[PDB]
Design a protein around this ligand. Sequence first.
Ligand SMILES: CC(=O)N[C@@H]1[C@@H](O)[C@H](O[C@@H]2O[C@H](CO)[C@@H](O[C@@H]3O[C@H](CO)[C@@H](O)[C@H](O)[C@H]3NC(C)=O)[C@H](O)[C@H]2NC(C)=O)[C@@H](CO)O[C@H]1O
Length: 159
Amino acid sequence: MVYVSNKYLTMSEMKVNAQYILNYLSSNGWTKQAICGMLGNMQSESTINPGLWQNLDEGNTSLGFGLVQWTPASNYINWANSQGLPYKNMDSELKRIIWEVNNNAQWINLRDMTFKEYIKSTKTPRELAMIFLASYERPANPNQPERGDQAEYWYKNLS
Ligand SMILES: CC(=O)N[C@@H]1[C@@H](O)[C@H](O[C@@H]2O[C@H](CO)[C@@H](O[C@@H]3O[C@H](CO)[C@@H](O)[C@H](O)[C@H]3NC(C)=O)[C@H](O)[C@H]2NC(C)=O)[C@@H](CO)O[C@H]1O
Protein backbone atom coordinates (compact mmCIF):
# COMPACT_ATOMS: atom_id res chain seq x y z
CA MET A 1 0.00 0.00 0.00
CA VAL A 2 1.55 3.28 -1.14
CA TYR A 3 0.25 6.77 -2.08
CA VAL A 4 1.08 7.86 -5.63
CA SER A 5 -0.37 11.18 -6.75
CA ASN A 6 0.28 14.73 -7.90
CA LYS A 7 -0.59 16.18 -4.50
CA TYR A 8 1.26 17.06 -1.32
CA LEU A 9 1.02 14.23 1.24
CA THR A 10 0.05 14.71 4.85
CA MET A 11 2.33 13.47 7.55
CA SER A 12 0.27 10.29 7.92
CA GLU A 13 0.46 9.55 4.20
CA MET A 14 4.22 10.17 4.11
CA LYS A 15 4.64 7.74 6.88
CA VAL A 16 3.03 4.91 4.86
CA ASN A 17 5.35 5.59 1.90
CA ALA A 18 8.45 6.03 4.05
CA GLN A 19 8.07 2.64 5.74
CA TYR A 20 7.64 1.00 2.35
CA ILE A 21 10.88 2.56 1.06
CA LEU A 22 12.78 1.50 4.14
CA ASN A 23 11.67 -2.16 3.77
CA TYR A 24 12.50 -2.18 0.04
CA LEU A 25 15.95 -0.65 0.30
CA SER A 26 16.95 -2.72 3.36
CA SER A 27 16.59 -5.84 1.14
CA ASN A 28 19.03 -4.26 -1.29
CA GLY A 29 21.80 -3.62 1.18
CA TRP A 30 21.10 -0.08 2.45
CA THR A 31 21.41 0.95 6.13
CA LYS A 32 18.45 2.47 7.99
CA GLN A 33 20.54 5.64 8.53
CA ALA A 34 21.26 6.03 4.78
CA ILE A 35 17.65 5.34 3.92
CA CYS A 36 16.41 7.95 6.45
CA GLY A 37 18.94 10.52 5.24
CA MET A 38 17.44 10.01 1.76
CA LEU A 39 13.88 10.07 3.15
CA GLY A 40 14.60 13.41 4.83
CA ASN A 41 15.43 14.71 1.37
CA MET A 42 12.46 13.06 -0.34
CA GLN A 43 10.11 14.70 2.14
CA SER A 44 11.29 18.16 1.05
CA GLU A 45 11.45 17.19 -2.62
CA SER A 46 8.05 15.54 -3.01
CA THR A 47 6.51 14.81 0.40
CA ILE A 48 7.79 11.27 -0.37
CA ASN A 49 5.30 10.99 -3.22
CA PRO A 50 6.35 9.03 -6.36
CA GLY A 51 3.53 10.75 -8.30
CA LEU A 52 4.49 14.33 -7.70
CA TRP A 53 5.42 16.83 -10.37
CA GLN A 54 7.32 20.00 -9.47
CA ASN A 55 4.81 22.82 -8.76
CA LEU A 56 2.09 20.17 -9.25
CA ASP A 57 2.67 20.89 -12.93
CA GLU A 58 1.57 17.53 -14.39
CA GLY A 59 3.11 16.61 -17.73
CA ASN A 60 5.94 19.12 -17.73
CA THR A 61 8.88 16.77 -18.30
CA SER A 62 11.46 19.59 -18.20
CA LEU A 63 10.86 20.07 -14.48
CA GLY A 64 11.12 17.77 -11.42
CA PHE A 65 9.20 14.53 -10.99
CA GLY A 66 8.98 11.77 -8.37
CA LEU A 67 10.47 10.93 -5.00
CA VAL A 68 13.73 12.81 -5.44
CA GLN A 69 12.53 15.28 -8.11
CA TRP A 70 14.57 14.02 -11.02
CA THR A 71 15.12 17.32 -12.97
CA PRO A 72 14.53 17.24 -15.89
CA ALA A 73 11.90 14.53 -15.30
CA SER A 74 12.91 13.15 -18.64
CA ASN A 75 16.23 11.97 -16.96
CA TYR A 76 14.04 9.37 -15.19
CA ILE A 77 11.03 8.98 -17.45
CA ASN A 78 13.23 8.24 -20.50
CA TRP A 79 14.92 5.47 -18.45
CA ALA A 80 11.74 3.90 -17.17
CA ASN A 81 10.20 3.90 -20.70
CA SER A 82 13.42 2.47 -22.17
CA GLN A 83 13.45 -0.21 -19.41
CA GLY A 84 9.80 -1.20 -19.92
CA LEU A 85 8.85 0.03 -16.44
CA PRO A 86 5.82 2.16 -15.64
CA TYR A 87 7.24 5.58 -14.77
CA LYS A 88 4.58 6.67 -12.23
CA ASN A 89 5.27 3.95 -9.76
CA MET A 90 7.01 3.56 -6.44
CA ASP A 91 9.08 0.47 -7.33
CA SER A 92 10.08 1.91 -10.67
CA GLU A 93 11.53 4.98 -8.91
CA LEU A 94 13.31 2.83 -6.33
CA LYS A 95 14.74 0.73 -9.17
CA ARG A 96 16.10 3.94 -10.74
CA ILE A 97 17.84 4.83 -7.50
CA ILE A 98 19.36 1.31 -7.29
CA TRP A 99 20.41 1.66 -10.92
CA GLU A 100 22.12 4.95 -10.05
CA VAL A 101 24.17 3.48 -7.21
CA ASN A 102 25.23 0.54 -9.41
CA ASN A 103 26.23 2.70 -12.38
CA ASN A 104 27.58 5.72 -10.44
CA ALA A 105 24.95 8.04 -11.85
CA GLN A 106 23.46 11.20 -10.33
CA TRP A 107 26.00 11.47 -7.49
CA ILE A 108 28.83 13.98 -7.43
CA ASN A 109 31.37 13.39 -4.71
CA LEU A 110 31.44 16.80 -3.01
CA ARG A 111 31.75 15.54 0.56
CA ASP A 112 34.41 12.78 0.18
CA MET A 113 31.68 10.11 0.28
CA THR A 114 30.82 8.02 -2.78
CA PHE A 115 27.25 6.79 -3.42
CA LYS A 116 28.46 3.22 -2.57
CA GLU A 117 29.87 4.48 0.73
CA TYR A 118 26.66 6.42 1.44
CA ILE A 119 24.31 3.43 1.35
CA LYS A 120 26.47 1.46 3.84
CA SER A 121 26.98 4.41 6.21
CA THR A 122 26.09 4.49 9.87
CA LYS A 123 26.64 8.22 10.29
CA THR A 124 23.62 10.02 11.71
CA PRO A 125 20.48 10.46 9.61
CA ARG A 126 21.04 14.24 9.88
CA GLU A 127 24.62 14.05 8.51
CA LEU A 128 23.63 11.63 5.74
CA ALA A 129 20.67 13.87 4.90
CA MET A 130 23.05 16.77 4.38
CA ILE A 131 25.45 14.64 2.30
CA PHE A 132 22.64 13.32 0.09
CA LEU A 133 21.42 16.93 -0.37
CA ALA A 134 24.85 18.11 -1.51
CA SER A 135 25.83 15.07 -3.56
CA TYR A 136 22.63 13.79 -5.15
CA GLU A 137 19.85 16.40 -5.06
CA ARG A 138 21.77 19.67 -5.55
CA PRO A 139 18.82 22.14 -5.73
CA ALA A 140 19.18 25.85 -6.58
CA ASN A 141 18.75 26.60 -2.89
CA PRO A 142 21.33 24.54 -0.97
CA ASN A 143 20.16 25.76 2.48
CA GLN A 144 17.51 23.33 3.61
CA PRO A 145 18.59 22.16 7.11
CA GLU A 146 15.06 20.88 7.70
CA ARG A 147 16.01 17.86 5.53
CA GLY A 148 18.21 16.69 8.46
CA ASP A 149 15.43 17.28 11.02
CA GLN A 150 13.19 15.25 8.74
CA ALA A 151 15.74 12.41 8.42
CA GLU A 152 15.93 12.12 12.19
CA TYR A 153 12.10 12.25 12.41
CA TRP A 154 11.87 9.19 10.08
CA TYR A 155 14.71 7.39 11.89
CA LYS A 156 12.77 7.77 15.16
CA ASN A 157 9.30 7.05 13.84
CA LEU A 158 9.80 4.07 11.44
CA SER A 159 10.83 0.43 12.07
C1 LIG B 1 14.69 25.60 -9.22
C2 LIG B 1 15.29 24.40 -8.54
O1 LIG B 1 15.99 24.49 -7.52
N1 LIG B 1 14.98 23.24 -9.09
C3 LIG B 1 15.43 22.05 -8.39
C4 LIG B 1 16.49 21.32 -9.21
O2 LIG B 1 17.63 22.13 -9.40
C5 LIG B 1 16.93 20.05 -8.49
O3 LIG B 1 17.45 19.18 -9.46
C6 LIG B 1 18.88 19.19 -9.58
O4 LIG B 1 19.30 20.26 -10.44
C7 LIG B 1 20.71 20.37 -10.49
C8 LIG B 1 21.08 21.64 -11.27
O5 LIG B 1 20.52 21.56 -12.56
C9 LIG B 1 21.31 19.09 -11.11
O6 LIG B 1 22.73 19.12 -11.00
C10 LIG B 1 23.41 19.25 -12.27
O7 LIG B 1 23.48 17.99 -12.89
C11 LIG B 1 24.19 17.93 -14.12
C12 LIG B 1 24.20 16.47 -14.51
O8 LIG B 1 23.13 16.30 -15.40
C13 LIG B 1 25.63 18.43 -13.99
O9 LIG B 1 26.14 18.62 -15.30
C14 LIG B 1 25.76 19.73 -13.21
O10 LIG B 1 27.12 19.85 -12.81
C15 LIG B 1 24.84 19.74 -11.99
N2 LIG B 1 24.75 21.05 -11.40
C16 LIG B 1 24.96 21.26 -10.10
C17 LIG B 1 24.88 22.70 -9.69
O11 LIG B 1 25.19 20.37 -9.27
C18 LIG B 1 20.84 17.83 -10.38
O12 LIG B 1 21.14 16.65 -11.12
C19 LIG B 1 19.33 17.85 -10.15
N3 LIG B 1 18.94 16.78 -9.23
C20 LIG B 1 18.22 15.74 -9.62
C21 LIG B 1 17.84 14.80 -8.50
O13 LIG B 1 17.82 15.54 -10.77
C22 LIG B 1 15.74 19.26 -7.92
C23 LIG B 1 16.19 18.23 -6.89
O14 LIG B 1 16.81 18.82 -5.77
O15 LIG B 1 14.77 20.09 -7.29
C24 LIG B 1 14.26 21.11 -8.14
O16 LIG B 1 13.25 21.78 -7.42
